[PDB]
């Protein structure tokens, strides 16, 4: 049921452990709490991969820097 579909050799840490793309702010902040929430959500996504996970993360980074 998984013929092809390598997902560039993601291998289980890029999908759920998003510290390396989290790029820690002051972790006591509500922004960092939102990052924890969205990180847990993107970890629990099985339908999305690491590339769209990190473009979601970067979209939030861009919007938060805009504000």
């Amino acid at each position: 049921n998984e013929a092809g579909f390598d997902d560039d050799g993601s291998e289980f840490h890029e999908h759920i452990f998003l510290e390396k793309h989290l790029e820690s702010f002051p972790k006591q902040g509500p922004i960092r709490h939102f990052m924890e929430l969205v990180t847990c959500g993107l970890s629990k996504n099985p339908y999305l991969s690491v590339k769209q996970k990190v473009e979601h993360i970067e979209w939030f980074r861009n919007y938060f820097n805009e504000k």
């Binding site: 509500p30 939102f34 929430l37 979601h56 979209w59 919007y63 504000k67």
Partner: protein, 101 residues
């Protein structure tokens, strides 16, 4: 070459909602998280209220896949009542019998 203008309007809804799904997802998460300040949510309220009123999944009507009929559709084949009756009565649909229990 669609069944009717209502079906074509619905497929416009589907295609461009599927395009404009991600931004709405980010900003309605920004609605219903209770961490951010209220005005910092109000600017987000402005952005979704400006996001067009054809991509929100509130206009998506599951019509019949062969012939446009809003009410009376079985989801498992996207078929209307009498079209599903027609096909599963002529017998081109596997496993559907007449329920006699």
């Amino acid at each position: 070459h669609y069944v009717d203008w209502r079906m074509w309007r619905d497929v416009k809804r589907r295609k461009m909602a599927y395009e404009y799904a991600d931004e709405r997802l980010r900003i309605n998460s920004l609605r219903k998280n209770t961490i951010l300040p209220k005005i910092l949510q109000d600017v987000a309220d402005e952005e979704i209220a400006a996001l067009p009123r054809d991509s929100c999944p509130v206009r998506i009507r599951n019509r019949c896949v062969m012939t446009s009929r809003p009410r009376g559709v079985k989801r498992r084949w996207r078929l209307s009542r009498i079209v599903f009756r027609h096909l599963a009565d002529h017998g081109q649909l596997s496993g559907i019998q007449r329920a006699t229990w």
